[PDB]
Design a protein around this ligand. Sequence first.
Ligand code: SF4
Ligand code: SF4
Lengths: 198, 146
Amino acid sequence: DYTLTREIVTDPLNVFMGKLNDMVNWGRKNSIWPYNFGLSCCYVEMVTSFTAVHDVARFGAEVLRASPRQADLMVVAGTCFTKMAPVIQRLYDQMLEPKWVISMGACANSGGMYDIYSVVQGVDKFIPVDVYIPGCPPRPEAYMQALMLLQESIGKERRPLSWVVGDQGVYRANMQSERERKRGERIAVTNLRTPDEI
Amino acid sequence: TDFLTEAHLDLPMEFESIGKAGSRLGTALAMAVDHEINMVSLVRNLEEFFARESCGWCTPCRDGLPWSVKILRALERGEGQPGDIETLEQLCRFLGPGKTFCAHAPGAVEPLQSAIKYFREEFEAGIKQPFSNTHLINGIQPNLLK
Ligand code: SF4
Ligand code: SF4
């Protein structure tokens, strides 16, 4: 159950090529360089994650490039305004493969609370998103959880090793949804602490 | 009709004579209440009669005489709370001649206001517990009204 991009296909994978692909995916998922992109309040929570009290640096994702060429992760953390949607599209085009997209917050997910004339209702209207984060704003640890989700998504995708040989198509794994995976524990919740307590 | 005291006993039974005395002549068939009969139970019985035998057409008498009856039932058992006598005064003020559809309810709360005016100390003795209308809901902090 994979997905081809240049189609629901199967697992394509010599046994040495599988180990080579696993090492490539391990190196790509353990070194993810986000693009410094200040849109709205969700970016404030993103840079709150980048600080000392949360330390996204532990995952190897602290480099925070100001140039789209060096970065390989686009965290759309803010509202997709109509004036900035071409800017976001151009910055995504300037990135180089492999690249991944995380929508952070309700604005980047669907437009959020701003169903208004000057706001594009979600960045997935024009940019293929890999991980969505609900929240307004999502807390910094929610951004780190989404980073880990992106890491385990990257760790089993199949990409070409070299551009001169082999299949050049990009295979993305169809992950099981987090909602269906966590339904076994979320439904079993019975009692929560009362709101009058600290 | 309104209750009267011993100071009003030396007063002739006419219409105008009882007119400025704070009562009515009525059918001129008086009834005397001694010291042994408490006025709280007497007013409770009077309002219970006037509530169960009301016609129930108009809102103030129909939905306020049971409130006064329940207040007097609480005052009988000592379950009165601060805000009951004032409720009785507000109901009596809002049950005057023309405040209701007819004059049955002004005659109903004439004994209530008379026993309030002359025997208020017998009604305050029934107020024992503080005003508790709500109960505590676990998880919601109450709004501490001042
Ligand atoms: S989702 Fe909420 S916190 Fe995030 S950019 Fe929109 S308004 Fe700001
Ligand atoms: S005041 Fe008269 S009309 Fe109104 S409900 Fe009572 S008995 Fe009926």
